[PDB]
Structure 1
Amino acid sequence: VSTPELKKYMDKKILLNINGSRKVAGILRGYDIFLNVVLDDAMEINGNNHQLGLQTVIRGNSIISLEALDAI
């Protein structure tokens, strides 16, 4: 119903966490009312590194939160 307020994350690097460990750091290009996240230049971070193509789209069901890695 309501569009989520991700307007402040328009051209900033974010870090999604997926389900307990899959930290996908990317640049938010777009979102929906379902928290599906479009990321440009994604990067998997493990506690090693893994690249995830040029663009990607990530399902909002597995998305828990997201850290704003870049300053606003």
Structure 2
Amino acid sequence: KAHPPELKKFMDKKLSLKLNGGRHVQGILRGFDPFMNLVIDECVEMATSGQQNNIGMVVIRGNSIIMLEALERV
């Protein structure tokens, strides 16, 4: 207990992140903690309009992570 999420396999891979609020971003996994809070580099916001905007390196709180999908092969 106080377990890690099993995410080493996904380290330094490009990912597609579905967040709550119908929000979606894409970026490279740079790290994580036991709460599933993530560090995502070269992150891009995929606006509901279809337009995408570069936001750089960011922190996503694991709380609000619905789902992730790898855009690479692990």
Letter in structure 2 aligned against 1:29: R
The structure that is strand-richer by fraction is 2
Deviation, 1:13, is 0.5
Aligned residues: 71
Task: Give secondary structure in 2 for the equivalent of 1:8.
Answer: helix
Deviation per CA, 1:28-71, whole angstroms, max 9, x where unpaired?
00000001010010011134111112x11111111111001111
Give the percent of matched residue pairs that are identical in Structure 1 and Structure 2: 55
Say which SS state the counterpart of residue 62 (structure 2) adopts: coil
Give structure 2 stretches of 5+ with no counterpart: none
Show the counterpart of 1:51: 54
Per mean C-alpha deviation after superposition, the further-off stretch among 36-45 and 11-20 is: 11-20
Q: Secondary structure at the match of 1:40?
A: strand
Query: Over aligned residue pairs, what C-alpha RMSD do you find?
Result: 1.2
Residue 9 of structure 1, CA deviation: 0.3
TM-score, length-normalised on structure 2?
A: 0.87
Structure 2 residue matching 1:50: 3-state secondary structure: strand
The equivalent residue for 1:62 is 64
- Alignment gaps of 5+ in structure 1: none
> What's the TM-score once normalised by structure 1's chain length?
0.89
Q: CA deviation at 1:23?
A: 1.1
